[PDB]
Amino acid sequence: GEVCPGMDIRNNLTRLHELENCSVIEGHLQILLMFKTRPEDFRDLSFPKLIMITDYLLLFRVYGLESLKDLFPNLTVIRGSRLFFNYALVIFEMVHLKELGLYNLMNITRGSVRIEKNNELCYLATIDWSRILDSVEDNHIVLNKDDNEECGDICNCPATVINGQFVERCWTHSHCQKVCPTICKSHGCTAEGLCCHSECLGNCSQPDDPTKCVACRNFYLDGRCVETCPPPYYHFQDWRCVNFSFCQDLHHKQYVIHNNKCIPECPSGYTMNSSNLLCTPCLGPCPK
C-alpha cells in the first residue's frame, strides 16, 4: 500500500486527508484537540486502508466522534516500537465516544491500553483484552460510562473466562470480537478457523501463505513476511528491511548502522565512523 510518517493532527479536520492512501504509518498517530467538530463531519469519513501503526495510537478531545468503526475499521496491528508512557493505545477525554469498533484489531505488540474519562463510552467490558495484548496487567480503563454498571451492551459471539462467569465478546451491536482457536496464537485464522501462516501477524487473505499476511509478524521485505533481514539488508523501524543506500539517504540531512540495524543514534560506548555510518567502540573514553 503506502508507508507514511508518524502524524500529529489537530484543530481542523482538513489535515486528516494526508493519510488517505496510507497502509502503514511508520511511527505514531495522534489525533487531538478538535473542539468545533460535529457528528456529521464523521458520518461520511473513513480510513479503511490503514492496516498497521508501528508505534502507538492516541485520541484526545475529539468532539462529535461517536464510534471508530468507520474511522479505522481495518487497523489490525499496533506494534508499539515506541510507547506513549507505557501505552500503545490511548483513548482519553473522548467525549462523545459510545463504542470502540476496532473490530479488526487483533494484536497490540508490546504496549498496554489506557482508556479513561470517556463518559458515553460502553462496549468495553465486552472485549477480552487478553486476546489483543500480551500484558493486560497494566491496562488502565477507568471512569467510562461502563464503570456505572449501567450499560445497554448488545451483540452469537464467544464467551471467555476473565471473571467468575463467561462473557459474550463484541465491539458493536453488529460486530463480534474475532477469536482464533487457542493454538493458532497470534497468526490469525480464516472465518472457519484454519490457522494463517506462522510469519503472518493478525489476519490473512489466504491460508498457509507468507505473501498473503495482512500485517507481518517479524519483518517485511519485498512482498513477503520473513523471520529476519538477510544481509545486505538492514533492520529498520523494527518492522521492515532495507539496503544500505536507503538508510544512507535518510541520514544525509539522523540514521546510523550498528548490529545490522538502521537506527537514529549510535548506542552508548560507540562513536560514528564517517566513511560507512557504522558505529565503532571508542578509543579510550567516549566524548559524546
Binding site: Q30, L32, L33, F60, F84, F85, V90, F92, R114
Partner: peptide, 11 residues
C-alpha cells in the same frame, strides 16, 4: 500521567 499527557501534547 495526565501530567505526561499535557507536558508532551503542547506546541
Amino acid at each position: 500521567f495526565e501530567d505526561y499527557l499535557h507536558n508532551v501534547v503542547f506546541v
